[PDB]
A paper describes a structure:
The molecular target of diamide insecticides is the ryanodine receptor ([name]), a large ion channel expressed in the membranes of the sarcoplasmic and endoplasmic reticulum (SR and ER). RyRs govern the release of Ca2+ into the cytosol, driving multiple events, including muscle contraction. Diamide insecticides directly engage and activate insect RyRs, causing uncontrolled Ca2+ release, leading to tonic muscle contraction, paralysis, feeding cessation, and eventually, death of the insect. Therefore, we designed a series of insect-like chimeric RyRs that contain the diamide-binding pocket from Sf [name] and the remaining parts from rabbit [name] (rRyR1).
We solved a cryo-EM structure of chiRyR in complex with FLU. chiRyR was recombinantly expressed in HEK293 cells and purified to homogeneity. Since FLU is a channel activator, we reasoned that it may bind better to open channels and thus added a cocktail of [name] activators (Ca2+/Caf/ATP/CaM1234) to help saturate its binding. The pore is in an open conformation, which is expected with a cocktail of activators including FLU. A masked refinement of the transmembrane region led to a local resolution of ~3.5 Å near the FLU binding site, allowing an unambiguous assignment of the FLU ligand. The binding site is located at the interface between the transmembrane region and the large cytosolic cap of [name]. FLU is primarily stabilized by van der Waals interactions supplemented with hydrogen bonds (H-bonds). It is coordinated by several residues from the transmembrane helices S1-S4, including Lys4563, Tyr4564, and Leu4567 from S1; Ile4657 from S2; Tyr4791, Ser4792, and Tyr4795 from S3; and Asp4815, Gly4819, and Val4820 from S4 (rRyR1 numbering). Among them, Lys4563 and Asp4815 play key roles in sandwiching FLU by forming H-bonds from two opposite sides. Additionally, Arg4824 from the S4-S5 linker is also important in stabilizing the pose of the sulfide amine group via H-bonding. Furthermore, FLU induces a slightly greater displacement in the S4-S5 linker than TET does, probably due to the additional contact between Arg4824 from the linker and the sulfide amine moiety in FLU.
Residue numbers in the entry:
A (entry chain L): 1 to 56, 61 to 129, 135 to 148
B (entry chain H): 1 to 107
C (entry chain D): 244 to 292, 299 to 323, 333 to 360, 372 to 427, 434 to 630
D (entry chain D): 1648 to 1751, 1758 to 1788, 1793 to 1873, 1923 to 2014, 2020 to 2047, 2091 to 2216, 2222 to 2262, 2267 to 2369, ...
E (entry chain D): 3634 to 3684, 3693 to 3737, 3750 to 3972
Write the structure that this text describes.
Amino acid sequence: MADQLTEEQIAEFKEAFSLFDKDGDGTITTKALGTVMRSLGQNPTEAELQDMINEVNGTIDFPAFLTMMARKMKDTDSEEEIREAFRVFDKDGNGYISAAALRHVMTNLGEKLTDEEVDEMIREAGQVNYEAFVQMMTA
Amino acid sequence: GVEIETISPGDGRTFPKKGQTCVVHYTGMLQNGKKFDSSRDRNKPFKFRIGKQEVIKGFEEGAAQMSLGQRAKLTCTPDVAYGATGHPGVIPPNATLIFDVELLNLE
Amino acid sequence: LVYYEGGAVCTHARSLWRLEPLRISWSGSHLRWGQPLRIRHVTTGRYLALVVVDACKAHTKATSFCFRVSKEKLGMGPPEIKYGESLCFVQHVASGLWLTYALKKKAILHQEGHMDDALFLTRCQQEESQAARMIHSTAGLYNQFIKGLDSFSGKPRGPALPIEAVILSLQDLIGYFEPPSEELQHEEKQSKLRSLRNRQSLFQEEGMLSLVLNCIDRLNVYTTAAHFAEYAGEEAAESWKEIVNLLYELLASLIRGNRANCALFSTNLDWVVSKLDRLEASSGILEVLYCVLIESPEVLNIIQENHIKSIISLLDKHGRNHKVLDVLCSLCVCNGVAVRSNQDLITENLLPGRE
Amino acid sequence: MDILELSERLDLQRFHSHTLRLYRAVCALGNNRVAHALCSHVDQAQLLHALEDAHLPGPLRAGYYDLLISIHLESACRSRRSMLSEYIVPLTPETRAITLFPPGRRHGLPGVGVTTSLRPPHHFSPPCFVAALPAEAPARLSPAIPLEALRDKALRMLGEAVRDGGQHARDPVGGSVEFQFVPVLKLVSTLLVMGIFGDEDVKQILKMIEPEVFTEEEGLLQMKLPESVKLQMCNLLEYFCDQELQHRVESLAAFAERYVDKLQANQRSRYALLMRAFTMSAAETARRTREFRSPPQEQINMLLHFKDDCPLPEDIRQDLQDFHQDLLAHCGIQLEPQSLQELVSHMVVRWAQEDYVQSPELVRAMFSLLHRQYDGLGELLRALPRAYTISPSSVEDTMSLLECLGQIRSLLIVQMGPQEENLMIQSIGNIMNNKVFYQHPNLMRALGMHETVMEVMVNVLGEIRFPKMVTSCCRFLCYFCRISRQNQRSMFDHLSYLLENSGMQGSTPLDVAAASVIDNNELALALQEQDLEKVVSYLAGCGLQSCPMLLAKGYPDIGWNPCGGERYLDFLRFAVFVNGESVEENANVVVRLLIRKPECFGPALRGSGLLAAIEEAIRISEDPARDGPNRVHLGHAIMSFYAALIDLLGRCAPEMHLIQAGKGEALRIRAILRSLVPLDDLVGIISLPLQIPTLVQPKMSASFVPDHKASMVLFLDRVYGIENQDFLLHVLDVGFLPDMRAAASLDTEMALALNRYLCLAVLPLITKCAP
Amino acid sequence: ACFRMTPLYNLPTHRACNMFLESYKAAWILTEDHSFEDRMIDDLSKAGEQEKKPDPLHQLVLHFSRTALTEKSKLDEDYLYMAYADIMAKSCHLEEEVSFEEKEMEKQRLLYQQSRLHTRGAAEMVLQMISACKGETGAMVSSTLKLGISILNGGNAEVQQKMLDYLKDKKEVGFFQSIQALMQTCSVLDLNAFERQNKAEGLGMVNEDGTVINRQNGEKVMADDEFTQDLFRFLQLLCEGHNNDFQNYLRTQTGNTTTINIIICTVDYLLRLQESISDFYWYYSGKDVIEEQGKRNFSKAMSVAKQVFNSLTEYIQGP
């Protein structure tokens, strides 16, 4: 799903891609793919370069370029989302969220979870930490 | 095969130079006489730049061979324009063309 | 050979059978059980004997059949045999041999029988059955007319073919196939059309299209209307001009409107266009080409530049006929879809001469 | 001879009438290369002269008018009428000042004012015949004609005709009242849909219809008209009700950007007051479910509930209802003839009282107009899914997109030839790098773009005529299906048609169907059963016959299909395995159906040894005479096919937690898959050594790959299982420590074909059995 | 991901307007009611009065009859006819402790609006298009049956007498076959898509700012419900006044060539319903309690069962 990127990145990507576009076709060389990411500050080595082209002839087209841009920014946000997800629980922001302050924040979020499952969330997990909570949520 | 026969003389001294535009109120025929084109019916003074080969070769070679305000009858040979195939739909293959032009202004 | 089939040949002209008991008088009395009868195919005119056979070699000893319910060791009529309910078989009255199968399940008189010879009858329809027997009446004349022509097909002249018999027989067929009027009421016009859609599909399926195509191609070879008609003589020579024109009117009356029969000319399209300058019935063939090029759009894009150059050559030798501009107006588009290959073959040929 | 003599010639009138049908039919449906070619034969002035020479006969007047639009005003006509049904409004401040009623409850004039919906310009090109011929040409535009001169002439000929018709003259222009108006309305109607009239011009046109109503002579509607002239009145009036509707939508788009700019500051001030409120905790989260816990789609649904529990103040909740009463009164609901819908509903019904109309076209165009006025609310509703709203910084690329959209719809109606194919590919290749196709996937779905590219794949498949086209279309759909999930939801709906044409190199229509069901539990759960049995019936063919293209290539003969049959199992392994998990309801019905035709399995196990089948493959792959002799080697496809039959059934293995329960159905399947395959056949396959590259590189597509081993390890680790320590250590030294130190040797091409194989297939299975 | 949801003021304003239209139409415009369906049909009927010609309404159903008689294989889905099928249907639903007299005027005003259609030939239009369906259970045969009920609602008599003669002068085999075709394509309770819905019901909100549209999936089990109830409700209303000729017509089309005996065909759907409801018992015969979705399915199947027993007994209410 290519929707996980916001607009201005694609605006920045197309600005970067058209800057190194070969003839305006939207084709670039295999080398220029490395240079254009380092033109965007991203510095992956040839290991992260090699597996991406064979995932998709030396001719990189702009949708074929963009689908690789989705996956490189999908994995990084997938792990940094869950610590800031725990930030709203604890009043301080460290990881010390009291279990008393959970059974009204969890029945009031909008996935329509009733009292039985937020119970079932808890007794199959005092204040619990964050890293056990990112373990008990991802499962 | 660019035969210019005059119809009315112009200035006699002003000639179009290269890198320049012209305005021609032309019309054309075939050797049978059937009028395949005009410009006055479209009420538009047709313009073009000389040298850049926008028109066919028999046209611009006739064009610089005129004076400003002159009226000339041209005769472009088959080999100078639309030689083998001709225009699609309009001009038949190996057709000799007959023109009536007039340099309006601008050299 | 007798066969079986699904539903496609169930409706058509072949699967129509009529019963003929041995007694002459009161033959249309109610048939009862244990009654001897003959079996007639209507289109071929052959008699079923388990093969079908000609009437001249159909004998009461050879072919005489009967309707029995099941083989226990055994004016008008009483109403014995119901419709759709009797479920009775056939066997020979001299042999007792049950006709049964072996998609073409070949029917054979078999002394073992089966559990599947319980077969139910269905009565046909009045307009269809009238259309049936005239096929036999025409094809018996037409193949007689073809081989009558084939006799002197190579031998010049320094039996008599049926000239007057065939002229009247076509003209009834034209009025048989005549399309209904536009001034008719709409609900009845639509009803009469679907009758006509059957009884031209009912002809072109059971032969009668190529059979008409044959008697053209035995006749078209005599382009001199009298000199090459002198292979017959002077008798048939005076009527040669008529018999061609009536023939193309029949064929044009066949494929009018119908899409399915119009695809039957996708193979011999070049057979049609090759006879456009034939100088006899020039309107006739041009009529046939116009009705085929408006019903089935697949015949458009199978046309090359050699065909269009004949049609413009037809217009240049037959005056300013306004029908020729119709067939070129059908050649551009089909079903709201244009053909860019055909829209330039006309233009760079017709227009640029301006003459 | 003079052309007016055709009025009594009556034969060359007809033959010159039917010539005009040939002229309109040749330049028909946007054939614009030939449209210049006719502009020689019938000049520009003599066509404009023939529009008003009243002494022309009957059928020759309706020719020279209809010739004119068919060479000048048709190629632009269809493309703009196509973009009328959709409404794309930008946020300029000119848009921002648009109301329903004009300021001054007096209903405004229809079609008069300012509209802002995007439409492409027309791109006419002037005709010439002395320009030199180049050469494939890109395209030819429609040949031009001066429009600002044309609108004054067309208005004048209408303006006399409504005035001269009141005189009731015995000699009408062109021989009837029918020919006096039908070739002047259908030009004015097609200059009104192209929008080239000024508003003061259509102010005059409103006077010329019924001046008693539309004023800020006798009216045209009161005039007795024959039946066909009523028809063009409907096609004239149908433009006007749409200009009421497109103005209404552009009014509501102007209302919203004034409204949601007022709504965001209300929320962010309310949230900051929520951010400083500590007076409650159990009721605070009931105020916090909306702020960051709900999705923004659910916010607006919750915010807009105050008709008859809303966090909005009474000040900005009433003006919406004040706006809502401004709209129903703008429509036909009085909501307790000086109106357009009052005029039409009078006029159309009175036309039925005039006579018994026989032409079925007019009776459809009447009643469709009449229903449009009475359910004026529902007329607004059905257009609103085609309403979309974009940013004003995106307009400079959006209209560049729409022109590249229009060439496709022009190619919808022409039978495809070898030139416009190169127009279609160059079109599509210019869509997929236009940057707005991605950032608004609702809009691309709203314009029916995903529908349009399907039908041009329909017409080509009906032997393949144009294969280079059909790849780039199905490549576009595969790149379309992963833009948003709901776009994949839409493309899913054409599955049975896509399935009917599974029947080569490059992409395929079937990979469209594969990318329509991937990565989504919703579709995979909703996948039909009848849509499954078609997939195995094409799998029922490949095991019995060969590839006819391969024996045409001079390859050795193999009675089944190691290359063609693998184009279904890669689909079906997306049909039961999603998100790294197996489904249940599809897995329990694919294997019940896969065993009804046991020919669908590979015939070496239908039987020879499974390791022996791959052993039978190594000889025919290493020997070039038994190999296929160029891109297709038979030995590389047989091991690849059995790499597909294995890992499919591994991905239909019921999951472990259902085996811990006593689900007898779920363990019935786990019996069958274990019953089919011997375990020790896998062990010789899992342990066979490979041609490691060193000093030379072997060929990937003719030899053993690590992806052949990757299918087998998934089968044993999902249906057979590693139980005891000895059988763990049984296959351990034989298979992988040969390969591990072969991999540790090269610390290169197949080194990276095997590095990812180890890190994704076996090193998990080791860590499954590490205690 | 439910916690990282961005607020509205962080969004760009054009997307904020987009979800508003999907909301504002959903909560305001769709909810709006109006009664234009009666103030149309009067002036299409009254305008025959002016200063043997057909009425404006009478012209219309003649035109819809003409498009139903042209020979085509399928029946093309016209949106315009469906736009007029419901409007004429709602002309009778306004009338479709009380006194004795006041319900008779509530009855007879329904026979007024029923007369306002079926003297203009509305009875045979709705009889032709069922023969023009030939079994294609699309959206039009939904919208054509709601008109067929609102003419024969309350057990009108002469519309049946306007219908029997039409099936006796035409001998139209093809009606009854299309009747038999729609009968067999009536969904029943399954035991496979039911848990497919239930496994689908385990998801409440989809990732990335999307909502699981529960009406998009809807009821995958027995979405054929209100249609197949409506056909038997139409079929019940053909012998409501115990019109004994239809009791001998619906089992034997004796003028026709081929009988169908819908009475037997009504039995065979009932048997297919009978096992389908019984196997729904055996799934729940082990369970103790019943959840919410289990009853909504079972509420559906008996509501169509009460319709078909009522439609059964009107074949035999007359002796």
